[PDB]
Amino acid sequence: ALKQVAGSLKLFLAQYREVAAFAQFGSDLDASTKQTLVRGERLTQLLKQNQYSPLATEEQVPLIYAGVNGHLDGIELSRIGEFESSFLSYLKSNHNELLTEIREKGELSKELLASLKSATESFVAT
Amino acid sequence: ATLKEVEMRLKSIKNIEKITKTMKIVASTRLSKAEKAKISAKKMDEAEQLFYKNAETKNKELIVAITSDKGLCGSIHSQLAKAVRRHLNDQPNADIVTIGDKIKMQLLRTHPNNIKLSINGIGKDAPTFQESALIADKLLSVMKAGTYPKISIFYNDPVSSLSFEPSEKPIFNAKTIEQSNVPRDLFEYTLANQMLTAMAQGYAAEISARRNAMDNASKNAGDMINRYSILYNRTRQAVITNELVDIITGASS
Amino acid sequence: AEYFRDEEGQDVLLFIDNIFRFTQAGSEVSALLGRIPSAVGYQPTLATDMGLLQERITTTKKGSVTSVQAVYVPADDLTDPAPATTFAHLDATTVLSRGISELGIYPAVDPLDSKSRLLDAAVVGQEHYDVASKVQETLQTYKSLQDIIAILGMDELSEQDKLTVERARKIQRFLSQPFAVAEVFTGIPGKLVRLKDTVASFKAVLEGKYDNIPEHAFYMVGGIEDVVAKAEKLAA
């Protein structure tokens, strides 16, 4: 389940490492590089974690799903953590069946892949 | 040449090389924007030169010299200064209007007498019609451009993305264009457009030259990195050997 | 040499080539004599052995000994204990350098590391001292600009830095000189330059009188007169 979503993360973070050298010259950068910075900064913020606070995979895969598929781009970076802690609280009361199925099966069916999109956009609406 | 010294110098040159590569790609980016203004200006300049060509117009002096005043452009400013000096030695009586601080510095290191106040600071970006028209008006009112028997404009022609050439162009005064009040206004307007196109070509040449200069800088820094990596490996082996010799001598006392 | 100095009362030239081989020789036997090796394997007694030898060479009230010594530098490492300890024993030093040699600048003397007691305004006069100090300032500026010249090239230097680098390059090449001994394998006729002529030539070069001469006209000639003559031959 984590391998399915974490695939492009590994590539986006490398592209971010390459482009971050350009941030000091931001005035004359391509829109593609602007998008790359927007995505990579939010991915880097998303991977912060507090001590003594380990997450189960059921809680990890939704967060990395939101990060990888760009749902974070519409959120101000300075509160991505506030998003994440809230987002999980949403999933654990609405769509808790999805977390149960991620725990039980350990893999994402196409139904679950679509449901993650639907739930993520339902939350990110607010 | 301690291991720490070599490692620090190697890291410094690595930082320089990365900076130069980044600037090289940034220059390649600005080149795409510059090309559009260059094309736009070139169309209009050719269109209005076709009038003087069809009319078969032909020929104290006013020499305008165009550079951006930006550094790290390499051979740009010195090449244009060379061309300007070669021209000026044939007509020392000419008064000069340098656009750009660097070329003003060039024509103050040599032939300082020929200009009191240079036009500086405005040559940053691709030519705006407002800026070019205002500079032409300054030449007319401040430089008394309306009076000179002969006018020349020097700029760097962007011969290629990889090369450029110092180039000079005449402007026929109102009394000069009369031969095959309207001529005076058209003279001022033609000077404005000619200067705009020359400044566009200069901007394109500047950005191309900066691209190539940063490319060369990055390649040179890479060569230096190779040399200092070799030296670092040698120093590493030497340090290990010397420390181990000290230890072995201590043991075998 | 000491018998000539003390008993004959004469003036003696004493050439030694190569004194490092004395120190090295002791090291070869040091381990067999049962001594514990010193740093980088030299004998413990290096400093006192070399003092006992070299300070016999001194001139005295009985007579004068003018001693010229060649010192090897292992692996070009001037920090090696033997050259490092030998430096303390000399009035004049001439540090030949591979870095200068690779440029083709024979006799390859390093003009900054080479140093002498007598380069003193009270000995050589104020003009000679001023010329030498200005030469070394120019050369040091040029050496300080090496990294910039390598990476960015000449164009981005300050204009007076450009002028200083040009004069430094010309001074570098003007310090080269063809010896008659090397003529066998260089093919360049031997040349000899008087002291006053040298000072005048370098003062003229510093003052910019010959800025218009191409730098290759300075390579392997003696005196500014030969510089101008070679400028003529290059113009032909």
Coordinates of C-alpha atoms in Angstrom, one line a residue:
Chain A
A1 CA 0.0 0.0 0.0
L2 CA 2.8 2.4 0.8
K3 CA 4.9 1.3 -2.2
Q4 CA 2.0 2.2 -4.5
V5 CA 1.8 5.8 -3.4
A6 CA 5.5 6.4 -2.4
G7 CA 6.7 5.7 -6.0
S8 CA 6.7 9.2 -7.4
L9 CA 7.7 10.7 -4.1
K10 CA 11.2 9.3 -4.5
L11 CA 11.4 11.1 -7.9
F12 CA 9.8 14.4 -6.9
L13 CA 12.2 14.8 -4.0
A14 CA 15.2 14.3 -6.3
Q15 CA 13.8 16.9 -8.8
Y16 CA 13.4 19.2 -5.8
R17 CA 17.0 18.7 -4.7
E18 CA 18.1 19.6 -8.2
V19 CA 15.9 22.7 -8.6
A20 CA 16.4 24.1 -5.0
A21 CA 19.7 25.5 -6.1
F22 CA 17.7 27.8 -8.4
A23 CA 15.6 29.3 -5.7
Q24 CA 18.0 32.2 -5.1
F25 CA 17.5 33.2 -8.8
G26 CA 13.7 32.9 -8.6
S27 CA 12.9 35.9 -10.8
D28 CA 13.6 34.1 -14.1
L29 CA 12.6 30.5 -13.5
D30 CA 10.3 28.4 -15.7
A31 CA 6.7 27.7 -14.6
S32 CA 7.7 24.0 -14.4
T33 CA 10.5 24.8 -11.9
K34 CA 8.0 27.0 -9.9
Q35 CA 5.7 24.0 -9.8
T36 CA 8.6 21.8 -8.8
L37 CA 9.5 24.1 -5.9
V38 CA 5.8 24.3 -4.8
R39 CA 5.5 20.6 -4.7
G40 CA 8.9 19.7 -3.2
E41 CA 8.8 22.3 -0.4
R42 CA 5.4 20.8 0.7
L43 CA 6.7 17.3 0.4
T44 CA 9.7 18.2 2.6
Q45 CA 7.3 19.9 5.1
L46 CA 5.1 16.8 5.0
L47 CA 7.9 14.5 6.1
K48 CA 8.5 16.3 9.3
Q49 CA 7.5 14.2 12.4
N50 CA 7.5 14.7 16.1
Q51 CA 9.4 12.5 18.5
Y52 CA 7.8 9.5 20.1
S53 CA 5.0 9.8 17.6
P54 CA 5.2 6.9 15.1
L55 CA 2.4 6.6 12.5
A56 CA 0.8 3.4 11.3
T57 CA 0.8 2.8 7.5
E58 CA -3.0 3.3 7.4
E59 CA -2.2 6.9 8.5
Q60 CA 1.0 7.3 6.4
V61 CA -0.4 6.4 2.9
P62 CA -3.2 9.0 2.9
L63 CA -0.7 11.8 3.7
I64 CA 1.8 10.8 1.1
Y65 CA -1.1 10.3 -1.4
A66 CA -2.1 13.9 -0.8
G67 CA 1.5 15.1 -1.1
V68 CA 2.3 13.1 -4.3
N69 CA -0.8 13.9 -6.2
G70 CA -0.5 17.7 -5.6
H71 CA -3.5 18.2 -3.3
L72 CA -1.1 20.2 -1.0
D73 CA -0.4 22.7 -3.7
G74 CA -3.6 24.7 -2.8
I75 CA -2.6 24.9 0.9
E76 CA -0.3 27.5 2.4
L77 CA 2.9 25.7 3.3
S78 CA 3.3 27.2 6.8
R79 CA 0.5 25.0 8.2
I80 CA 0.9 21.7 6.3
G81 CA 1.4 20.0 9.7
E82 CA -1.9 21.5 10.9
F83 CA -3.4 20.1 7.8
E84 CA -2.0 16.6 8.4
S85 CA -3.0 16.2 12.0
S86 CA -6.5 17.5 11.0
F87 CA -6.7 15.3 7.9
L88 CA -6.0 12.1 9.8
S89 CA -8.6 13.1 12.4
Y90 CA -11.0 13.5 9.4
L91 CA -10.2 10.0 8.0
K92 CA -10.5 8.4 11.4
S93 CA -14.2 9.6 11.7
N94 CA -15.2 9.8 8.1
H95 CA -14.0 7.1 5.7
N96 CA -12.7 5.1 8.6
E97 CA -13.5 2.0 6.5
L98 CA -10.7 3.1 4.2
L99 CA -8.2 3.0 7.1
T100 CA -9.6 -0.3 8.2
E101 CA -9.1 -1.8 4.7
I102 CA -5.6 -0.3 4.4
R103 CA -4.7 -2.0 7.7
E104 CA -6.3 -5.3 6.8
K105 CA -5.3 -5.8 3.2
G106 CA -2.0 -4.0 3.2
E107 CA -2.6 -2.9 -0.4
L108 CA -4.7 -0.4 -2.3
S109 CA -7.4 -1.7 -4.7
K110 CA -8.4 0.6 -7.5
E111 CA -11.5 1.3 -5.5
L112 CA -9.3 2.4 -2.6
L113 CA -7.1 4.5 -5.0
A114 CA -10.2 6.3 -6.2
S115 CA -11.6 6.6 -2.6
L116 CA -8.4 8.3 -1.4
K117 CA -8.8 10.9 -4.1
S118 CA -12.5 11.5 -3.2
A119 CA -11.8 11.8 0.5
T120 CA -8.7 14.0 0.0
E121 CA -10.7 16.4 -2.1
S122 CA -13.7 16.2 0.2
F123 CA -11.4 17.4 3.1
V124 CA -9.3 19.9 1.1
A125 CA -12.5 21.7 0.1
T126 CA -12.1 23.0 3.7
Chain B
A1 CA 48.7 21.9 2.2
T2 CA 47.1 20.1 5.0
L3 CA 44.1 17.7 4.3
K4 CA 41.7 20.2 5.9
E5 CA 43.1 23.1 3.7
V6 CA 42.7 21.0 0.5
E7 CA 39.2 19.8 1.5
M8 CA 38.1 23.4 2.2
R9 CA 39.4 24.7 -1.1
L10 CA 37.9 21.8 -3.0
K11 CA 34.5 22.6 -1.4
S12 CA 34.8 26.3 -2.3
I13 CA 35.6 25.6 -5.9
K14 CA 32.7 23.1 -6.0
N15 CA 30.4 25.9 -4.8
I16 CA 31.7 28.2 -7.4
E17 CA 31.2 25.6 -10.1
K18 CA 27.6 24.9 -9.0
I19 CA 26.9 28.7 -9.0
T20 CA 28.3 29.1 -12.5
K21 CA 26.2 26.3 -13.9
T22 CA 23.0 27.7 -12.3
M23 CA 23.8 31.1 -13.7
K24 CA 24.5 29.5 -17.1
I25 CA 21.0 27.9 -17.2
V26 CA 19.4 31.2 -16.0
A27 CA 21.1 33.0 -18.8
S28 CA 19.8 30.4 -21.3
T29 CA 16.4 31.1 -19.8
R30 CA 16.6 34.9 -20.2
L31 CA 17.8 34.4 -23.8
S32 CA 14.4 33.1 -24.8
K33 CA 12.7 36.2 -23.6
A34 CA 15.3 38.6 -25.1
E35 CA 14.9 37.0 -28.5
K36 CA 11.3 38.1 -28.8
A37 CA 12.1 41.8 -28.3
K38 CA 15.1 41.5 -30.6
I39 CA 12.8 40.1 -33.4
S40 CA 10.2 42.8 -32.8
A41 CA 12.7 45.6 -33.0
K42 CA 14.5 44.1 -36.0
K43 CA 11.3 44.0 -38.0
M44 CA 10.6 47.7 -37.4
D45 CA 14.2 48.7 -38.0
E46 CA 14.3 47.0 -41.4
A47 CA 10.9 48.4 -42.3
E48 CA 11.9 52.0 -41.7
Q49 CA 15.4 51.5 -43.2
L50 CA 13.6 50.4 -46.4
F51 CA 12.5 54.0 -46.8
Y52 CA 16.1 55.4 -46.8
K53 CA 17.1 52.5 -49.1
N54 CA 14.3 53.2 -51.6
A55 CA 14.9 57.0 -51.5
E56 CA 18.6 56.2 -52.1
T57 CA 19.6 58.5 -49.2
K58 CA 23.3 58.6 -48.4
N59 CA 25.9 60.6 -46.6
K60 CA 31.8 67.2 -35.9
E61 CA 29.9 63.9 -35.1
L62 CA 27.7 62.3 -32.4
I63 CA 28.7 58.8 -31.4
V64 CA 26.3 56.8 -29.3
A65 CA 27.7 53.6 -27.7
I66 CA 25.4 51.0 -26.2
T67 CA 26.0 48.5 -23.4
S68 CA 24.0 47.4 -20.4
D69 CA 26.6 48.2 -17.7
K70 CA 26.2 44.6 -16.4
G71 CA 29.2 42.6 -15.3
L72 CA 30.3 39.0 -16.0
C73 CA 29.4 39.4 -19.6
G74 CA 33.0 38.7 -20.7
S75 CA 34.3 40.2 -24.0
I76 CA 31.2 42.4 -24.7
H77 CA 32.3 45.8 -23.3
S78 CA 36.0 45.6 -24.3
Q79 CA 35.1 44.6 -27.9
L80 CA 32.7 47.4 -28.3
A81 CA 35.2 49.8 -26.8
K82 CA 37.8 48.6 -29.3
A83 CA 35.5 49.2 -32.2
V84 CA 34.6 52.7 -30.9
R85 CA 38.2 53.6 -30.4
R86 CA 39.1 52.5 -33.9
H87 CA 36.3 54.7 -35.2
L88 CA 37.1 57.6 -33.0
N89 CA 40.7 57.9 -33.9
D90 CA 39.5 58.8 -37.5
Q91 CA 37.2 61.6 -36.2
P92 CA 38.4 62.8 -32.8
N93 CA 36.1 65.8 -32.9
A94 CA 33.0 63.7 -32.3
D95 CA 31.0 64.1 -29.1
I96 CA 30.0 60.9 -27.4
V97 CA 26.9 59.6 -25.6
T98 CA 27.5 56.3 -23.8
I99 CA 24.4 54.4 -22.7
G100 CA 25.6 52.1 -19.9
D101 CA 28.1 52.6 -17.1
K102 CA 30.7 50.0 -18.3
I103 CA 31.1 51.5 -21.7
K104 CA 31.2 55.0 -20.2
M105 CA 34.1 53.6 -18.0
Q106 CA 35.7 52.2 -21.2
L107 CA 35.5 55.6 -23.0
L108 CA 36.7 57.4 -19.9
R109 CA 39.8 55.2 -19.6
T110 CA 40.5 56.3 -23.2
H111 CA 39.4 59.6 -24.8
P112 CA 37.9 60.9 -21.6
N113 CA 37.5 64.4 -23.0
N114 CA 34.6 63.6 -25.4
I115 CA 31.7 63.4 -22.9
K116 CA 30.6 65.2 -19.8
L117 CA 27.6 63.1 -18.6
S118 CA 26.8 59.5 -19.5
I119 CA 23.4 57.9 -19.5
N120 CA 23.5 55.1 -16.9
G121 CA 21.3 52.7 -15.0
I122 CA 18.4 52.5 -17.5
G123 CA 19.9 49.8 -19.7
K124 CA 19.0 46.9 -17.5
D125 CA 16.2 45.1 -19.3
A126 CA 15.0 44.5 -22.9
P127 CA 14.3 47.9 -24.5
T128 CA 11.0 49.5 -23.6
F129 CA 9.6 51.9 -26.3
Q130 CA 9.1 54.5 -23.5
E131 CA 12.8 54.2 -22.4
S132 CA 14.2 54.3 -26.0
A133 CA 12.0 57.3 -26.9
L134 CA 13.0 59.1 -23.7
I135 CA 16.7 58.5 -24.3
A136 CA 16.3 59.8 -27.9
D137 CA 14.6 62.9 -26.5
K138 CA 17.5 63.3 -24.1
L139 CA 20.0 63.1 -27.0
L140 CA 18.0 65.7 -28.9
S141 CA 17.5 68.1 -26.0
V142 CA 20.5 67.3 -23.8
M143 CA 23.0 66.0 -26.4
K144 CA 21.8 68.5 -29.0
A145 CA 21.5 65.6 -31.4
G146 CA 19.6 67.8 -33.9
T147 CA 22.8 69.7 -34.7
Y148 CA 25.4 67.2 -35.7
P149 CA 26.4 66.8 -39.4
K150 CA 26.9 63.0 -38.8
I151 CA 25.6 60.5 -36.3
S152 CA 26.8 56.9 -35.5
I153 CA 25.5 54.2 -33.2
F154 CA 27.7 51.4 -31.9
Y155 CA 26.3 48.2 -30.5
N156 CA 27.1 44.5 -30.2
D157 CA 25.3 42.6 -33.0
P158 CA 24.1 39.2 -31.8
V159 CA 25.6 37.3 -34.8
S160 CA 24.8 34.0 -33.0
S161 CA 23.8 32.5 -29.7
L162 CA 27.5 31.6 -29.5
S163 CA 29.0 34.8 -31.0
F164 CA 28.6 38.6 -31.4
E165 CA 30.3 41.3 -33.3
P166 CA 30.9 45.1 -32.7
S167 CA 28.8 47.0 -35.3
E168 CA 28.2 50.6 -36.2
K169 CA 25.3 52.2 -38.0
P170 CA 24.8 55.8 -39.4
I171 CA 21.7 58.0 -39.0
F172 CA 21.1 60.6 -41.6
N173 CA 20.3 64.0 -40.1
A174 CA 17.1 65.9 -41.2
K175 CA 19.2 67.9 -43.6
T176 CA 20.9 64.7 -44.8
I177 CA 17.7 62.8 -45.3
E178 CA 16.3 65.6 -47.4
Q179 CA 18.2 64.4 -50.5
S180 CA 17.0 61.4 -52.4
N181 CA 9.6 70.6 -40.6
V182 CA 8.4 67.0 -41.3
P183 CA 12.0 65.9 -41.9
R184 CA 13.1 67.0 -38.4
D185 CA 10.3 65.1 -36.6
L186 CA 10.9 62.1 -38.8
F187 CA 14.6 62.4 -38.0
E188 CA 14.0 62.3 -34.3
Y189 CA 11.5 59.4 -34.7
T190 CA 13.9 57.4 -36.8
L191 CA 16.7 58.0 -34.3
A192 CA 14.4 56.8 -31.6
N193 CA 13.5 53.6 -33.4
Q194 CA 17.1 53.0 -34.5
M195 CA 18.4 53.4 -31.0
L196 CA 15.6 51.1 -29.7
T197 CA 16.7 48.4 -32.2
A198 CA 20.4 48.8 -31.4
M199 CA 19.7 48.5 -27.7
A200 CA 17.6 45.4 -28.3
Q201 CA 20.4 43.8 -30.3
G202 CA 22.8 44.8 -27.5
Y203 CA 20.6 43.2 -24.9
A204 CA 20.4 40.0 -26.8
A205 CA 24.2 39.9 -27.4
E206 CA 24.7 40.6 -23.7
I207 CA 22.6 37.7 -22.5
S208 CA 24.1 35.3 -25.0
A209 CA 27.6 36.4 -24.0
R210 CA 26.8 35.9 -20.3
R211 CA 25.4 32.4 -21.1
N212 CA 28.7 31.5 -22.8
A213 CA 30.8 33.1 -20.1
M214 CA 29.1 31.2 -17.3
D215 CA 29.5 28.0 -19.4
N216 CA 33.2 28.6 -19.6
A217 CA 33.4 29.5 -15.9
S218 CA 31.7 26.2 -15.0
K219 CA 34.0 24.1 -17.2
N220 CA 37.1 25.8 -15.8
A221 CA 35.9 25.2 -12.3
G222 CA 35.3 21.6 -13.1
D223 CA 38.8 21.2 -14.4
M224 CA 40.1 22.8 -11.1
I225 CA 37.9 20.3 -9.1
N226 CA 39.6 17.4 -11.0
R227 CA 43.0 18.8 -10.1
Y228 CA 42.2 19.4 -6.5
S229 CA 40.5 16.0 -6.1
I230 CA 43.8 14.4 -7.3
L231 CA 45.7 16.5 -4.8
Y232 CA 43.3 15.6 -2.1
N233 CA 43.6 11.9 -2.7
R234 CA 47.4 12.3 -2.6
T235 CA 47.2 14.2 0.7
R236 CA 44.9 11.6 2.2
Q237 CA 47.3 8.8 1.5
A238 CA 50.2 10.9 2.8
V239 CA 48.4 11.7 6.1
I240 CA 47.5 8.1 6.7
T241 CA 51.0 6.9 6.0
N242 CA 52.6 9.5 8.3
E243 CA 50.3 8.9 11.2
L244 CA 50.8 5.1 10.9
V245 CA 54.6 5.6 10.8
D246 CA 54.3 7.6 14.0
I247 CA 52.2 4.8 15.6
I248 CA 54.6 2.1 14.5
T249 CA 57.6 3.9 15.8
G250 CA 55.9 4.4 19.1
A251 CA 55.2 0.6 19.3
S252 CA 58.7 -0.5 18.3
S253 CA 60.5 1.7 20.8
Chain C
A1 CA 88.8 25.0 2.6
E2 CA 89.5 25.7 6.3
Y3 CA 93.2 25.1 5.7
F4 CA 93.1 27.8 2.9
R5 CA 91.1 30.1 5.2
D6 CA 93.1 29.9 8.4
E7 CA 96.7 28.8 7.5
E8 CA 97.1 30.3 4.0
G9 CA 95.0 33.4 5.0
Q10 CA 93.5 33.4 1.5
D11 CA 89.9 34.0 0.3
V12 CA 88.1 30.8 -0.5
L13 CA 85.2 29.8 -2.7
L14 CA 83.7 26.6 -1.3
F15 CA 81.1 24.9 -3.6
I16 CA 79.1 21.9 -2.2
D17 CA 76.8 19.8 -4.4
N18 CA 74.7 18.4 -2.8
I19 CA 74.7 19.0 1.0
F20 CA 71.4 17.3 1.5
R21 CA 73.2 14.1 0.5
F22 CA 75.2 14.4 3.7
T23 CA 72.1 14.4 5.8
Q24 CA 70.5 11.7 3.8
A25 CA 73.6 9.6 4.2
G26 CA 73.4 9.7 7.9
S27 CA 69.8 8.6 7.8
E28 CA 70.8 5.5 5.8
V29 CA 73.1 4.5 8.6
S30 CA 71.0 5.8 11.5
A31 CA 68.8 2.7 11.8
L32 CA 71.8 0.3 11.7
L33 CA 73.5 2.3 14.5
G34 CA 70.5 1.5 16.8
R35 CA 68.9 4.9 17.0
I36 CA 65.1 5.3 17.3
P37 CA 64.0 7.0 14.0
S38 CA 62.9 10.7 14.2
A39 CA 60.1 12.3 12.2
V40 CA 59.7 10.9 8.6
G41 CA 62.5 8.5 9.5
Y42 CA 65.4 10.9 9.9
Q43 CA 68.1 10.4 12.5
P44 CA 67.6 12.0 15.9
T45 CA 70.9 13.9 15.6
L46 CA 70.0 15.6 12.3
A47 CA 70.0 19.2 13.7
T48 CA 73.2 18.9 15.6
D49 CA 75.1 16.9 13.0
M50 CA 74.2 19.5 10.4
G51 CA 75.1 22.4 12.7
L52 CA 78.5 20.8 13.5
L53 CA 79.2 20.5 9.8
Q54 CA 77.7 23.7 8.4
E55 CA 78.9 26.2 11.0
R56 CA 82.5 25.3 10.3
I57 CA 81.9 27.0 6.9
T58 CA 81.6 30.4 8.5
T59 CA 84.0 33.2 7.6
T60 CA 86.3 34.4 10.4
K61 CA 88.7 37.1 11.3
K62 CA 91.5 35.0 9.8
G63 CA 90.0 34.8 6.4
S64 CA 86.8 34.7 4.2
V65 CA 85.0 31.7 2.9
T66 CA 82.3 32.3 0.3
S67 CA 80.3 29.0 0.3
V68 CA 77.7 28.2 -2.3
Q69 CA 75.6 25.1 -1.5
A70 CA 73.0 23.1 -3.4
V71 CA 70.3 21.6 -1.3
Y72 CA 68.0 18.8 -2.5
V73 CA 64.3 19.0 -1.6
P74 CA 62.8 15.5 -1.4
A75 CA 59.5 15.2 -3.3
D76 CA 59.6 19.0 -3.8
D77 CA 58.6 19.2 -0.1
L78 CA 60.3 22.3 1.4
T79 CA 58.7 21.3 4.8
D80 CA 60.9 18.2 4.9
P81 CA 63.1 18.4 8.1
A82 CA 66.4 18.5 6.1
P83 CA 65.7 21.6 3.9
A84 CA 63.7 23.2 6.7
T85 CA 66.6 22.9 9.1
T86 CA 69.1 24.0 6.4
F87 CA 67.2 27.2 5.8
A88 CA 68.4 28.5 9.2
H89 CA 72.1 28.3 8.2
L90 CA 72.2 30.6 5.2
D91 CA 72.6 34.3 4.4
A92 CA 71.2 34.0 0.9
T93 CA 68.7 31.4 -0.5
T94 CA 67.6 30.7 -4.1
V95 CA 64.5 28.4 -4.2
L96 CA 64.3 26.8 -7.6
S97 CA 60.7 25.6 -8.3
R98 CA 59.2 23.0 -10.6
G99 CA 56.1 25.3 -10.9
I100 CA 58.2 28.0 -12.5
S101 CA 60.2 25.4 -14.6
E102 CA 57.1 24.0 -16.2
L103 CA 56.3 27.4 -17.6
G104 CA 59.6 27.1 -19.4
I105 CA 61.0 29.9 -17.3
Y106 CA 64.6 28.9 -16.7
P107 CA 66.6 29.2 -14.4
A108 CA 63.3 28.5 -12.6
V109 CA 64.1 30.6 -9.5
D110 CA 61.0 31.3 -7.4
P111 CA 61.1 35.2 -7.2
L112 CA 59.0 35.3 -4.1
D113 CA 60.4 32.4 -2.0
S114 CA 64.0 33.3 -2.9
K115 CA 65.2 35.7 -0.2
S116 CA 68.5 37.3 0.9
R117 CA 69.8 39.1 3.9
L118 CA 71.5 41.8 1.7
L119 CA 68.2 43.0 0.1
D120 CA 68.5 45.9 2.5
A121 CA 68.1 49.6 1.6
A122 CA 71.3 50.3 3.6
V123 CA 73.3 47.8 1.5
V124 CA 71.9 48.0 -2.0
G125 CA 70.7 51.6 -1.9
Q126 CA 67.1 52.9 -1.9
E127 CA 66.6 52.6 -5.7
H128 CA 67.5 48.9 -5.9
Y129 CA 65.4 48.1 -2.8
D130 CA 62.4 50.0 -4.2
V131 CA 62.6 48.2 -7.6
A132 CA 62.9 44.8 -6.0
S133 CA 60.0 45.5 -3.6
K134 CA 57.8 46.8 -6.4
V135 CA 58.6 43.7 -8.5
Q136 CA 57.6 41.4 -5.7
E137 CA 54.4 43.3 -5.0
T138 CA 53.5 43.0 -8.7
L139 CA 54.3 39.3 -8.8
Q140 CA 52.3 38.7 -5.6
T141 CA 49.3 40.5 -7.0
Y142 CA 49.5 38.4 -10.1
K143 CA 49.8 35.2 -8.1
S144 CA 46.8 36.3 -5.9
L145 CA 44.7 36.7 -9.1
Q146 CA 45.5 33.1 -10.4
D147 CA 42.1 31.5 -9.4
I148 CA 40.1 34.4 -10.8
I149 CA 42.1 34.4 -14.1
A150 CA 41.6 30.7 -14.4
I151 CA 37.8 30.7 -13.8
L152 CA 36.5 34.0 -15.1
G153 CA 39.4 35.0 -17.3
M154 CA 41.0 38.4 -17.9
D155 CA 37.9 40.3 -19.0
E156 CA 36.3 40.6 -15.5
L157 CA 39.4 41.9 -13.8
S158 CA 39.5 45.5 -12.6
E159 CA 41.3 47.6 -15.3
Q160 CA 44.3 48.4 -13.1
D161 CA 44.4 44.7 -12.2
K162 CA 44.6 44.0 -15.9
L163 CA 47.5 46.4 -16.2
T164 CA 49.2 44.8 -13.1
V165 CA 48.7 41.3 -14.5
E166 CA 50.2 42.3 -17.8
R167 CA 53.2 43.8 -16.2
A168 CA 53.6 40.8 -13.9
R169 CA 53.6 38.4 -16.8
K170 CA 56.2 40.6 -18.5
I171 CA 58.3 40.6 -15.3
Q172 CA 58.0 36.8 -15.0
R173 CA 59.3 36.3 -18.5
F174 CA 62.0 39.0 -18.1
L175 CA 63.4 37.2 -15.1
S176 CA 64.3 34.2 -17.4
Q177 CA 67.8 34.2 -18.7
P178 CA 69.9 31.8 -20.9
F179 CA 73.1 30.5 -19.3
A180 CA 76.0 29.6 -21.4
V181 CA 76.2 26.2 -19.8
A182 CA 72.6 25.3 -20.8
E183 CA 73.4 26.3 -24.4
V184 CA 74.4 22.7 -25.1
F185 CA 70.7 21.6 -24.8
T186 CA 68.7 24.9 -25.0
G187 CA 70.4 26.2 -28.1
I188 CA 70.0 29.8 -26.9
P189 CA 73.3 31.7 -26.6
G190 CA 74.6 32.4 -23.1
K191 CA 73.8 35.8 -21.8
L192 CA 75.2 37.8 -18.8
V193 CA 73.6 40.9 -17.2
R194 CA 75.3 43.5 -14.9
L195 CA 73.6 44.5 -11.7
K196 CA 73.1 48.2 -12.5
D197 CA 71.7 47.2 -15.9
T198 CA 69.3 44.8 -14.3
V199 CA 68.0 47.4 -11.9
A200 CA 67.6 49.9 -14.6
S201 CA 65.8 47.5 -16.9
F202 CA 63.3 46.4 -14.2
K203 CA 62.7 50.0 -13.1
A204 CA 62.0 50.8 -16.8
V205 CA 59.6 47.9 -17.0
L206 CA 57.8 48.9 -13.8
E207 CA 57.4 52.5 -15.0
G208 CA 55.4 51.3 -18.0
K209 CA 58.0 52.5 -20.5
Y210 CA 57.8 49.2 -22.4
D211 CA 54.1 48.4 -21.9
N212 CA 53.7 48.3 -25.7
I213 CA 56.3 45.5 -26.2
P214 CA 54.8 42.0 -26.7
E215 CA 55.6 39.8 -23.7
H216 CA 57.4 37.1 -25.7
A217 CA 60.1 39.7 -26.4
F218 CA 61.0 39.5 -22.7
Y219 CA 61.5 35.7 -22.7
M220 CA 65.1 34.5 -22.6
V221 CA 67.0 37.8 -23.1
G222 CA 69.4 39.8 -21.1
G223 CA 68.9 43.5 -20.5
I224 CA 66.1 45.7 -21.9
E225 CA 68.3 46.4 -24.9
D226 CA 67.9 42.8 -26.0
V227 CA 64.2 43.1 -25.2
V228 CA 63.8 45.9 -27.8
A229 CA 66.0 44.1 -30.3
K230 CA 63.9 41.0 -30.0
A231 CA 60.8 43.2 -30.3
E232 CA 62.3 44.3 -33.7
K233 CA 63.0 40.7 -34.7
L234 CA 59.4 39.7 -33.8
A235 CA 58.0 42.7 -35.7
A236 CA 59.9 41.6 -38.9

